[PDB]
Amino acid sequence: MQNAYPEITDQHREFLKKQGLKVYEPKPLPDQINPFSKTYWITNAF
Amino acid sequence: YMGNPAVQSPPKEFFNYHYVPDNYPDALSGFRIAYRDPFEVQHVFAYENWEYQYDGQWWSMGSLACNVLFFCTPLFLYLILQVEELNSEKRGGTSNKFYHNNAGFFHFQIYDNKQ
Amino acid sequence: MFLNPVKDSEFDDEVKGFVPSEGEVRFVANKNKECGYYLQGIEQCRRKMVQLAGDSSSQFHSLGFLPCKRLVDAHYRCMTDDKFGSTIEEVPEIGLDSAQKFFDCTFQQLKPMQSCRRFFDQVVRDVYRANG
Amino acid sequence: AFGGFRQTDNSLIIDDRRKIILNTRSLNDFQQKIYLRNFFTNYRPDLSSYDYFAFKEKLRIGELFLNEYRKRINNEVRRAAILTPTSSLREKMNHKIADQILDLSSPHVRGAHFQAVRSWTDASKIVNYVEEKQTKINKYGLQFPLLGNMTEEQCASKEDEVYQRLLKEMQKPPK
Amino acid sequence: ASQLQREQKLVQSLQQESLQPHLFKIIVDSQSDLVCEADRREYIKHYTRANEKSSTSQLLQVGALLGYIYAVGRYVSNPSTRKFSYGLAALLGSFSLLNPSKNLHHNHSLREIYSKYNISTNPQALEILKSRIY
Amino acid sequence: MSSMLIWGACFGLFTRAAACKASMIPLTTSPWKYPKYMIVSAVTFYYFDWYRRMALEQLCYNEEKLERYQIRAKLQSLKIGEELSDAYRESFFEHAVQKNNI
Amino acid sequence: MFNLNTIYLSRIFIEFNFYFLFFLFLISSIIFYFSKIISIQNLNQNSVFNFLKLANIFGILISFFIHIISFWFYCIYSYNLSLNIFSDINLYNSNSIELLNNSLLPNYFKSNITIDFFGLILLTLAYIVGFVSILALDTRLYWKNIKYIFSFTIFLLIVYVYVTVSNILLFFMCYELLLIPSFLIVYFVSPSRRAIQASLYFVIWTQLGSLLVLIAISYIISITNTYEFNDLKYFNFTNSESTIIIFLIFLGFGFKAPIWPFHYWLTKTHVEAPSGFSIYLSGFLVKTALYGFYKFNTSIFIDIDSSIFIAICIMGVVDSSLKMWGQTDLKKLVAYGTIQEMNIIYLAFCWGDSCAILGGILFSATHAFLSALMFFLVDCIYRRYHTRSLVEVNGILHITPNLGLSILFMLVFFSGIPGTIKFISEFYIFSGLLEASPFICFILMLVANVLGLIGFSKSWFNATFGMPKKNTKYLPMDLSFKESYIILYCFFFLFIFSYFSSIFF
Amino acid sequence: MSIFSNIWINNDLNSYGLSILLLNIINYLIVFMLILSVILLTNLSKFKSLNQFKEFNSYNFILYSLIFSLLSMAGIPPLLGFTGKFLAILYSSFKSQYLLILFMTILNIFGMYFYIQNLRFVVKKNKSSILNYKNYYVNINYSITLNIILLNFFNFFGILFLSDLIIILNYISSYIYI
Amino acid sequence: MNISYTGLKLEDYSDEVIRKYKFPNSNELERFLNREQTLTVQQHKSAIKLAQQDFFAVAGLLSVGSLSYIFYNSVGGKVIRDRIRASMPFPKRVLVQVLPFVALGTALIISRRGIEGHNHGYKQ
Amino acid sequence: GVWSNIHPTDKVTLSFANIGRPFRLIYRPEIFLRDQQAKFIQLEKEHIEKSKKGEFVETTSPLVLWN
Numbered sequence A: 001m002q003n004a005y006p007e008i009t010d011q012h013r014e015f016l017k018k019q020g021l022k023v024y025e026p027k028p029l030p031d032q033i034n035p036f037s038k039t040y041w042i043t044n045a046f
Numbered sequence B: 001y002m003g004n005p006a007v008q009s010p011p012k013e014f015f016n017y018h019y020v021p022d023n024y025p026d027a028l029s030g031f032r033i034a035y036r037d038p039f040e041v042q043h044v045f046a047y048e049n050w051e052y053q054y055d056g057q058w059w060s061m062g063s064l065a066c067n068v069l070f071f072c073t074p075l076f077l078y079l080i081l082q083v084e085e086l087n088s089e090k091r092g093g094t095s096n097k098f099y100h101n102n103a104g105f106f107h108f109q110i111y112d113n114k115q
Numbered sequence C: 001m002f003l004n005p006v007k008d009s010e011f012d013d014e015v016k017g018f019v020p021s022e023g024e025v026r027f028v029a030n031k032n033k034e035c036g037y038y039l040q041g042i043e044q045c046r047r048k049m050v051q052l053a054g055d056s057s058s059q060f061h062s063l064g065f066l067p068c069k070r071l072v073d074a075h076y077r078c079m080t081d082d083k084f085g086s087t088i089e090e091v092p093e094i095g096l097d098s099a100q101k102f103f104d105c106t107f108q109q110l111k112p113m114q115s116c117r118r119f120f121d122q123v124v125r126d127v128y129r130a131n132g
Numbered sequence D: 001a002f003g004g005f006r007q008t009d010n011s012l013i014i015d016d017r018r019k020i021i022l023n024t025r026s027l028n029d030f031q032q033k034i035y036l037r038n039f040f041t042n043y044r045p046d047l048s049s050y051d052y053f054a055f056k057e058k059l060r061i062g063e064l065f066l067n068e069y070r071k072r073i074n075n076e077v078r079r080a081a082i083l084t085p086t087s088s089l090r091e092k093m094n095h096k097i098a099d100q101i102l103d104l105s106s107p108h109v110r111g112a113h114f115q116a117v118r119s120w121t122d123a124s125k126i127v128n129y130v131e132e133k134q135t136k137i138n139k140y141g142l143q144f145p146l147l148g149n150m151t152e153e154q155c156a157s158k159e160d161e162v163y164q165r166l167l168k169e170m171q172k173p174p175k
Numbered sequence E: 001a002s003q004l005q006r007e008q009k010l011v012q013s014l015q016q017e018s019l020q021p022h023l024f025k026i027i028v029d030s031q032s033d034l035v036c037e038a039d040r041r042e043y044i045k046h047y048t049r050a051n052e053k054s055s056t057s058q059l060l061q062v063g064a065l066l067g068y069i070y071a072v073g074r075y076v077s078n079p080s081t082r083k084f085s086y087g088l089a090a091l092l093g094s095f096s097l098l099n100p101s102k103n104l105h106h107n108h109s110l111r112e113i114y115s116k117y118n119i120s121t122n123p124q125a126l127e128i129l130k131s132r133i134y
Numbered sequence F: 001m002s003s004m005l006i007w008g009a010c011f012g013l014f015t016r017a018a019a020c021k022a023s024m025i026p027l028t029t030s031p032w033k034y035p036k037y038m039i040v041s042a043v044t045f046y047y048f049d050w051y052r053r054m055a056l057e058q059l060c061y062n063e064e065k066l067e068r069y070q071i072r073a074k075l076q077s078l079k080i081g082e083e084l085s086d087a088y089r090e091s092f093f094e095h096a097v098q099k100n101n102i
Numbered sequence G: 001m002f003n004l005n006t007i008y009l010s011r012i013f014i015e016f017n018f019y020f021l022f023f024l025f026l027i028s029s030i031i032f033y034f035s036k037i038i039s040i041q042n043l044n045q046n047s048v049f050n051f052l053k054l055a056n057i058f059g060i061l062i063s064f065f066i067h068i069i070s071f072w073f074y075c076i077y078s079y080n081l082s083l084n085i086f087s088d089i090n091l092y093n094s095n096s097i098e099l100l101n102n103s104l105l106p107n108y109f110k111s112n113i114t115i116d117f118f119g120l121i122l123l124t125l126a127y128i129v130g131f132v133s134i135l136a137l138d139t140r141l142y143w144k145n146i147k148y149i150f151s152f153t154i155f156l157l158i159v160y161v162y163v164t165v166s167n168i169l170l171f172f173m174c175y176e177l178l179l180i181p182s183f184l185i186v187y188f189v190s191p192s193r194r195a196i197q198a199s200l201y202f203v204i205w206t207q208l209g210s211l212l213v214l215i216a217i218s219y220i221i222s223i224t225n226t227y228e229f230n231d232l233k234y235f236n237f238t239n240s241e242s243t244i245i246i247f248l249i250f251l252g253f254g255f256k257a258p259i260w261p262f263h264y265w266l267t268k269t270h271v272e273a274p275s276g277f278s279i280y281l282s283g284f285l286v287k288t289a290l291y292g293f294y295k296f297n298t299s300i301f302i303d304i305d306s307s308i309f310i311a312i313c314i315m316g317v318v319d320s321s322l323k324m325w326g327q328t329d330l331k332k333l334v335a336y337g338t339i340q341e342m343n344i345i346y347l348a349f350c351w352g353d354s355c356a357i358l359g360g361i362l363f364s365a366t367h368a369f370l371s372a373l374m375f376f377l378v379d380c381i382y383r384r385y386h387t388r389s390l391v392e393v394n395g396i397l398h399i400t401p402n403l404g405l406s407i408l409f410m411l412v413f414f415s416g417i418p419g420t421i422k423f424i425s426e427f428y429i430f431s432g433l434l435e436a437s438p439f440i441c442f443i444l445m446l447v448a449n450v451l452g453l454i455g456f457s458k459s460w461f462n463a464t465f466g467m468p469k470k471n472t473k474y475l476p477m478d479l480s481f482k483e484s485y486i487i488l489y490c491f492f493f494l495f496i497f498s499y500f501s502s503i504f505f
Numbered sequence H: 001m002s003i004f005s006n007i008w009i010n011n012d013l014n015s016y017g018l019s020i021l022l023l024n025i026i027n028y029l030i031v032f033m034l035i036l037s038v039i040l041l042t043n044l045s046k047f048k049s050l051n052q053f054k055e056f057n058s059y060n061f062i063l064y065s066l067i068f069s070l071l072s073m074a075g076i077p078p079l080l081g082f083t084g085k086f087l088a089i090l091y092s093s094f095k096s097q098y099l100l101i102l103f104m105t106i107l108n109i110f111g112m113y114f115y116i117q118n119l120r121f122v123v124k125k126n127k128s129s130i131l132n133y134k135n136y137y138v139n140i141n142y143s144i145t146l147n148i149i150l151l152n153f154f155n156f157f158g159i160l161f162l163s164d165l166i167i168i169l170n171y172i173s174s175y176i177y178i
Numbered sequence I: 001m002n003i004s005y006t007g008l009k010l011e012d013y014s015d016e017v018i019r020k021y022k023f024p025n026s027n028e029l030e031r032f033l034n035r036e037q038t039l040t041v042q043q044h045k046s047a048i049k050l051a052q053q054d055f056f057a058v059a060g061l062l063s064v065g066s067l068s069y070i071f072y073n074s075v076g077g078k079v080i081r082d083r084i085r086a087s088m089p090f091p092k093r094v095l096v097q098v099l100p101f102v103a104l105g106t107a108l109i110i111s112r113r114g115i116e117g118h119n120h121g122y123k124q
Numbered sequence J: 001g002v003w004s005n006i007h008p009t010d011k012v013t014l015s016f017a018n019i020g021r022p023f024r025l026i027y028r029p030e031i032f033l034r035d036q037q038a039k040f041i042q043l044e045k046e047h048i049e050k051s052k053k054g055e056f057v058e059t060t061s062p063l064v065l066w067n
């Protein structure tokens, strides 16, 4: 699959980082939400 | 035709419930059978026994235009389907055709050989 | 099956699909409905000759599948409409490789006759494309 | 043995191949089979029963694959609706996504339609597209186990083949 | 390096005898000319019989537990829950310690089949098994 | 299963039982009828199996004889003028000339 | 990771489940015949009728569980079998897996078993609807007519042969064997005196349809002297022959569907048949007619326009939907609902083997369960209040709250709520018809989902609500556990079948 | 009947139609004996009008034998009378007679309602008394009962064994022209 | 009839024809003759035996569980059943509870092992 | 079983699905074919004999019968 969006330059990305902006990235599930976590299974046992 | 608002005496001769000989009765909830209302039973067994009196009565009874439209409804449906077939043919869409694109193989049918 | 290798490719086995002509499809279908007896005969002959002379101690083991050679030649003549020789050895050079593949897949790697039909029809299609 | 039904039409039949003239009303079962019942009833009559079963399965998978294309483009549009505000969504969508959406439209994909009306050439093209995808995923042995059933020895041999192929492709000059 | 280590592991597995039936099964699956066709057929039959996982083991374990419960609830008069629970635990532990109907009359036939070929020191065995490693 | 004698014996047993039920007489009535019915049914169905095999064999032979009759009827059913036509001249002369050696 | 074991698992389970049902039926029949002289019920506790009921109900239930397992085995086998042909792209090797027959039991009728998804869906409907119907017939089987406790086992065996044979003649025969047990049930088990004429009408209508199907199959057999669908694939019918065949099969299976104007028998029978058979008649047998039509038409190339058949089906839908307001009898109203649903399903099979049979199969299952639930509710009402007409019973919700709640939730499910499977079938069929004919799709949706629904809800809402003032001394009790659990199982299936694997839908 | 290089190929059996006619006649005779064996088992004077099918309403054997014989006469499958009509229609299709098939279907449906119409009359308000009295008790003839049992077996399950009868009749008819 | 080895000589054909019509090796010929080029008859027989045993185990367990569940939970009304179950020894109550569940559960477990492929050896 | 051990097809199918067909063809297909191929087999034998003489007959070339 292709990128589907108009490409931007690394100089533009550096400029945006200079202006205080942050690149959006997905965040991992917390231990409570993650169904493969000791916290999840301790909650289940409780 | 419509019901008569006038008060009428209860019917003396009306179709009633009849059971097969040697019928095992329904004994649910203590086997309590109440006497049936004559007017209610008459309405129960009225439509099933209603008949037309003379030839052609079915046309003019009620609304002649509505009866004609109801009678011609299958023809109207077929003609509308023909118009839609014209539209699909002009546009190469799904037609009213028996699409034999599987060459006879059935839907998820097992096709295995015996040794 | 109906794929041609891409001559200039970024990877080893990139292929591109193609569709045969309606004339080729009609010809192959008609001949297969007219010459399908020979193909079933080749299958049954292969099985019977393996039953008879398959054992190495048999007298006819050295003859191999030669009794089915007549069936193969008859199938070739029927599929080619008696215009490209009386034997499959007289096949045009375009269908030579496909004929070799058919013979291998029919008598050396005794595959089910579906693959053998694929290769024989490939021979017929090559001949048809050469001499449409 | 296949038979036939007696015909009632009084129409002459002329065969150039056999140089014979026949009447439709007077035909035996074999003559009806070779003259009246000689037409085709499937997209690829040149294929065997097994080959056309494979062709039909690949055609169904291809229709579902085009529907999968449309569903994926819809999911990416939904993703754009969330990750991109409306102030600039339509520009980025008209960049590349809108063209693909219109490419995967009512005639080009079956969608919810009862029958995808394809000619035999179109069905063959769809099946060839499916076969190209199958070839490019099987050269790397990706079919097992989602799209293929292979024994343990077959899996090991395929792994060795894919390893050799990967080494050869990695050690090729860039274009 | 890594491929050399994989080949060394293959040779080490060839040296061992526990993995030897498995390696010969891999050889047989390849349909190579190293193994005779009759040997292939017999080894396939014996290996299939030996590696069967029948449902009769679970059925017998189920029948023994239910049979014990029925017997102790049918004929014993005024049963003691302590002894009944101890017997349940003992039978479950015996099921745990009992091997799943392991057979010994099929593995020796496998060694009869594959002892005809010196798998440890066969140049063809390595060539066949170099490609096919699970 | 495989034995028509045993099939007939079972048929006779069940026929006797169903005749007892149908007559409303109790089972175990006229007990000698059970073995008698078993023997009669077994013999009858064994003979019918043999006779059907014989009839099938002789029917195959009669069909071999009948194929000649159908050919010679088709040649005799030709409409006037079709005997010497190109589609039937060879067969007509084979049967009229070659097959005339009495 | 699909191996040879699962293939034999599925095949063995199918064959040996048929033999399980047959052996249970045979043992039960032997016990029933050889333990009594007259074979009528001895009116005492120590009677074989208790054992007969137990054996038949348990055979149905356990064979249904085995059928669930075998259906899952078949689903896995069919998925992986279609995968194997699709998987391999090398031209040298083809999928050639030749199977051996089992040793313990023979092939019944010397026919190799062929299993399709529609056939096994039909078999599952047979099992469940027969279970519900036999549970609804215990109060009807008594002295001198207990012999019909085996009727649903006979139906299960007949349909088991019906949906598993590739022989066209055995297929037709198994389709033809469903008449005698049905007529015997209607003639001897029905309590209403008007049910004799209803049985006669059912027999004559369904047998005219069977005669048309017989003519079609006679054409098929005589023209191409064979009995196999593959041999049909190797033969082509001329345009006139194909037209005659399609007309005959459509008209016959529409006599059994039923279709306009051949639903008079269905109305009369449903009004007069016993509630158990009415559950079984509407739920299942019409689906056997649908399966027969699907098997016949898919295997034959037809070059005529199906607009006439589509018009007949849509006219049936409209005609059934417009008559729902004028029905004061709840059972007759449910019969008209059955007619509407059956015509809608039969519409989906007018496009050959396109992606329209999926909605037909799903709607067949949904209508089976919905008709079973509705006729069971009518049975509960008739057993409680001793009437079915709207003018005699109303206010059920206040005296029998569980029955009223069941009626209301039945209406909710019948209204095509998205959570259930009726909405899925409507979505399938209506999307296909809208792409085929938008105006006819709107007409069908308007008449069926508004006018018919309005009438259907009017006749049920008036029964549910009101005041049961008259006959307070004779007012019944609430729903029993059997009826409650049957209704809950119908609801549970209609809800959870939406989560079935989408591979086959 | 085809010809290839003066060699005739014959895929049709000329004697098959006569065998079908014989099978139809034999099936009708067998079903006619079945219905009239029940009549001869009873008081023959009890059956005068068509409404007096109620007289067959007796112990279940007579009742069910009557109703199944009537269904077989009407051609309801899989009873013995259905097989003859099915084979006749199959042969007519083989002979390519669509109009004859249509008229056979008309006659079959009309006669079928003619037969099953009497099934309504079998309903009786009580069990009937149609057996002759010998030695102060009803005379039930075991021999006729056994005959009816055999006829009922060959009427219910006769479709399973019809192939052997077809073979015998085709063998008999094969002598007509040879 | 004419498809036979009689009258055939290797000298009547060219070497290419002889080579391309030659028999394969003994192993290939035996595999083709026995129809065991992919799966052997012994593998098929083992699969059939396992399938039959699985069906019989599943059917027997389902029958036992169905009969035990009904014959133990259908002895009367709610109060009557409560009294009957209370007036039981502990092993009898355990049997009333354990037996119907164990048989059906084991049948379902056998079905689950049937539909699954954990035995595949290509694992790491 | 014993009733249906005479043909590998069920008795119902034998009774109804074989309309106007020779019982030789139904029960002994190989003998039926070899009997109808009597002249063709002789022509094929003559063709083989002439082929061994180096004389290829084009007319009887299609006649290559296996059964």
Ligand SMILES: Nc1ncnc2c1ncn2[C@@H]1O[C@H](COP(=O)(O)OP(=O)(O)O)[C@@H](O)[C@H]1O
Pocket (backbone or CB within 6 Å): B003, B004, B005, B006
């Ligand atoms: N079944 C019916 N058919 C026609 N008109 C009716 C019917 N029931 C009620 N009506 C009309 O509704 C009115 C209500 O009358 P009702 O209250 O039943 O009688 P009363 O006023 O004597 O108590 C009547 O005057 C009558 O005109």
